[PDB]
Structures are given as structure tokens and as C-alpha cells.
Design a protein around this ligand. Structure first.
Ligand SMILES: N[C@@H](CCSC[C@H]1O[C@@H](n2cnc3c(NCc4cccc(Cl)c4)ncnc32)[C@H](O)[C@@H]1O)C(=O)O
Length: 257
């Protein structure tokens, strides 16, 4: 090839575990989960986001990169961070989340946070087998990291192919697990011409993944954005651990819509 991303990946795989754990959060942003974790351990059902995902999606929404509305589909919902977040938003009328669950996979967590009544989370659902449904907002956070970039290329292309029939001039935010492999870039470019949007790096993502998100509201050069991330992540190998920038987690409140 060999792409910058592929060079990054080789370096990452060389790291000792100790080096890996220091590198993965070096200079990133993260929300302080202390209060939420404690609440959730005690079975508290209000205010707390169930995962770091609520803040991650919030970052895109507060920047208008995706603007959830009407019927929201959340593919690979896990515990439900994206779903519960969207459920509290003014333009949102219904949230449908699908996730695999079972061994190796997070189950949805029931909560009584704001707007929980327009929300249904369904486990036991492999979205590769789901036929597309009409939706006003399509979200997808699927993509499992692997030491092998060709395994990740395969997973990423599977996701891109799976999501396309759900895209019908709607709002969207889709995880692209490995955006640097050449075949992925071709698919993304084709998809961009057809459905628009842009690839964006979220500052809350760990340095241990090259994930970027395809969001509906933006434009830009995919190849440039991907290389920018590869250079960033590579540069973060060169210095001692920079402690992450710590921000407040989201308060999702209580009550119905
Ligand atoms: N955003 C969330 C955090 C969510 S993190 C991502 C979540 O997605 C779930 N998951 C993984 N593969 C899945 C699959 N098909 C398999 C598959 C694999 C690759 C490509 C395709 Cl098309 C299909 N079908 C359904 N769920 C899957 C996984 O258990 C995790 O909870 C939060 O805020 O909390």
C-alpha cells in the first residue's frame, strides 16, 4: 500500500499492554463517568446515561452534524446510550434500537430518563439480517476492532453495505470502523456522491481506534480527513502520555414525552 493508517495500525499492534493503556487515552477528551457508574451500580434509573455513547453522539448533535428527528433507528444500540439520548430531544418522536446481545455483547439497560416512552430497545437482533424500515434518522455504531486491518476492512464494508438500503434522504450518523483501507475509501466516496454528508473524527474516540463517523450534514474531502486522523494518531505515539481532557457527562433527566 501502504497507507498512513496501516502504519499506525502496525505501531499500535507492537505496543506492550502497559504502553497501549497509556497511549489509548493520550490527549483525548473524555467525560467523567464516576457519578453515572455509581448511580447505575445502585440501580438508579433517572439522569444517568447508560454508557459513554450518549456524550459521544451528543458531540455530533450539538454541532448540527446529525440532527435527530421523527422516527430514529439505532443499529447496534448496546446498552442504549444513543437511543436514550435521542429520546430526550424535541424533534424526536420514536426511537427503535436493535442490538445483538448474548455472550460477548451488551444487553439494553432499562432506564426512566427523559423521553423513555418513545423508546423500544430489542436484543437478539443481528442487523445484518434485518430488512430495512422507514426512518427519519438512521444511526449505526457497529464495528468491532481487531488486530487485523483486513478483518476490520471486511467488517467496515459489511456495515456500509448493510446501512445503505436504510438511507432514504434521512439524517444519519454511521460508524466507519476502519476508514483508511483503500477499498473502504472507494465505498465511502461512492456513498458520499449518492447520499452526501462527510466523515468526522470525534474527540471522545480513543487513540486505539481509527473510527470516524459518516454524518449527514457536512461536506468535505474524505481522503484528506482520513489522512488527518492517521497523522494525528501517529503523532500521539511520539510523546509521553498527555492526560485526557476531562468533561462533564450528560444529564438525561427524568419524565415522559
Ligand atoms: N451506541 C451505543 C454503543 C454501541 S457499541 C456497538 C454495539 O453493536 C452491537 N453489535 C455488534 N454487531 C452487531 C450486529 N450484527 C453483526 C454485524 C457485525 C459487523 C457488520 C454487520 Cl453489518 C453486522 N447486530 C446488532 N448489533 C451488533 C454490539 O454488541 C455493541 O453493543 C451506546 O451509546 O451505548
Amino acid at each position: 500500500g501502504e497507507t498512513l493508517g496501516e502504519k499506525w495500525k502496525k505501531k499500535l499492534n507492537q505496543l506492550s499492554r502497559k504502553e497501549f493503556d497509556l497511549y489509548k487515552k493520550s490527549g483525548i477528551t473524555e467525560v467523567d463517568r464516576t457519578e453515572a457508574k455509581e448511580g447505575l451500580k445502585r440501580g438508579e434509573t433517572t439522569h444517568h446515561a447508560v454508557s459513554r455513547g450518549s456524550a459521544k453522539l451528543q458531540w455530533f448533535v450539538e454541532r448540527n452534524m446529525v440532527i435527530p428527528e421523527g422516527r430514529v433507528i439505532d443499529l447496534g444500540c448496546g446498552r442504549g446510550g444513543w437511543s436514550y439520548y435521542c429520546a430526550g430531544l424535541k424533534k424526536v418522536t420514536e426511537v427503535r434500537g436493535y442490538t445483538k446481545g448474548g455472550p460477548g455483547h451488551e444487553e439494553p439497560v432499562p432506564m426512566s430518563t427523559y423521553g423513555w416512552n418513545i423508546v423500544k430497545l430489542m436484543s437478539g437482533k443481528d442487523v445484518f439480517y434485518l430488512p430495512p424500515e422507514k426512518c427519519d434518522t438512521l444511526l449505526c455504531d457497529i464495528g468491532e476492532s481487531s488486530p487485523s486491518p483486513t478483518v476490520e476492512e471486511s467488517r467496515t464494508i459489511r456495515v456500509l453495505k448493510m446501512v445503505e438500503p436504510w438511507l432514504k434522504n434521512n439524517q444519519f450518523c454511521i460508524k466507519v470502523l476502519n476508514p483508511y483501507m483503500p477499498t473502504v475509501i472507494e465505498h465511502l466516496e461512492r456513498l458520499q456522491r449518492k447520499h452526501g454528508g462527510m466523515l468526522v473524527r470525534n474527540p471522545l474516540s480513543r487513540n486505539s481506534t481509527h473510527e470516524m463517523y459518516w454524518i449527514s450534514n457536512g461536506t468535505g474531502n474524505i481522503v484528506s480527513s482520513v489522512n488527518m486522523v492517521s497523522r494525528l494518531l501517529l503523532n500521539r505515539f511520539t510523546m509521553t502520555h498527555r492526560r485526557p481532557t476531562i468533561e462533564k457527562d450528560v444529564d438525561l433527566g427524568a419524565g415522559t414525552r
